[PDB]
Design an enzyme around this catalytic site. Structure first.
Site, PDB file in Angstrom:
ATOM      1  CB  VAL A 194     -22.722 -31.214  16.766  1.00  0.00           C
ATOM      2  CG1 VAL A 194     -22.275 -31.748  18.103  1.00  0.00           C
ATOM      3  CG2 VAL A 194     -23.936 -30.036  17.342  1.00  0.00           C
ATOM      4  CB  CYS A 195     -17.007 -31.315  16.668  1.00  0.00           C
ATOM      5  SG  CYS A 195     -15.450 -32.342  16.015  1.00  0.00           S
TER       6      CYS A 195
END
Lengths: 163, 54
Positions: free
Chosen positions: A92-93
């Site tokens: 997840v960014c």
């Protein structure tokens, strides 16, 4: 790093767990994967309503560094899900998971919390930000071909639940 | 596959359970079970959903 840092991280993570359980945010189930290692959490999150993710539930691994909270945890969806702000590999960014692309805030800091991270992930699922996206294929599909985006997400949900 | 991963049987019944009464591990199993049951119902009325499986 230091033995002291490790001690502080474990103490802090216990408090994080207590707060999360106490607050009991809807659609989120998360805690240490095993009783003898508080640094690795297993999470299951319900896709937010009125999104392509609504009918799904999604497994993720939350891994805390030994000097937490001076470094953010890594969160990885397993298996990976299609989303503009999730790397193809599942990582997840989002801003809250990075230390000080593309500025503004809020980035990771010790005044943030696990509950806040998990709430941010839910918001992300509801409101993708393609301008800072980590999966460009997902970004383009979201922008240009929402029907196909949704078909792919929904098929993956069907398959994940044994259909 | 989520049911395999979280050891939810295909034919399991958890219709009487509330999340408040369950520990974390059982909460995950309930979430998966409810998701599956909710989709089963939807699938029987939603042709667009059915189309995705063919």
């Amino acid at each position: 790093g230091s033995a002291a840092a490790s001690k502080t991280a474990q103490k802090r993570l216990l408090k994080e767990l207590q707060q999360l359980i106490k607050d009991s945010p809807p659609g989120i189930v998360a805690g240490p994967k095993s009783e003898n290692n508080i640094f690795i959490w297993d999470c299951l999150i319900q896709g937010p309503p009125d999104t392509p993710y609504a009918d799904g539930v999604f497994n993720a691994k939350l891994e805390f560094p030994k000097d937490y909270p001076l470094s953010p945890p890594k969160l990885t969806f397993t298996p990976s899900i299609l989303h503009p702000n999730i790397y193809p590999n599942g990582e997840v960014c989002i801003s809250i998971l990075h230390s000080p692309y593309e500025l503004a805030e809020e980035r990771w800091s010790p005044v943030q919390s696990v509950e806040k991270i998990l709430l941010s992930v839910m918001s992300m699922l509801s409101e993708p930000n393609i301008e800072s996206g980590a999966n460009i294929d997902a970004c383009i599909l979201w922008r240009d071909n929402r029907p196909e985006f949704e078909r792919q997400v929904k098929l993956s949900i069907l398959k994940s639940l044994g259909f | 596959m989520l049911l395999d991963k979280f050891h939810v049987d295909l034919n399991e019944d958890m219709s009487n359970l509330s999340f408040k009464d369950l520990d974390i591990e059982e909460r995950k199993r309930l979430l998966v079970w409810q998701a599956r049951k909710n989709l089963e119902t939807k699938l029987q009325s939603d042709k667009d959903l059915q189309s995705l499986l063919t």
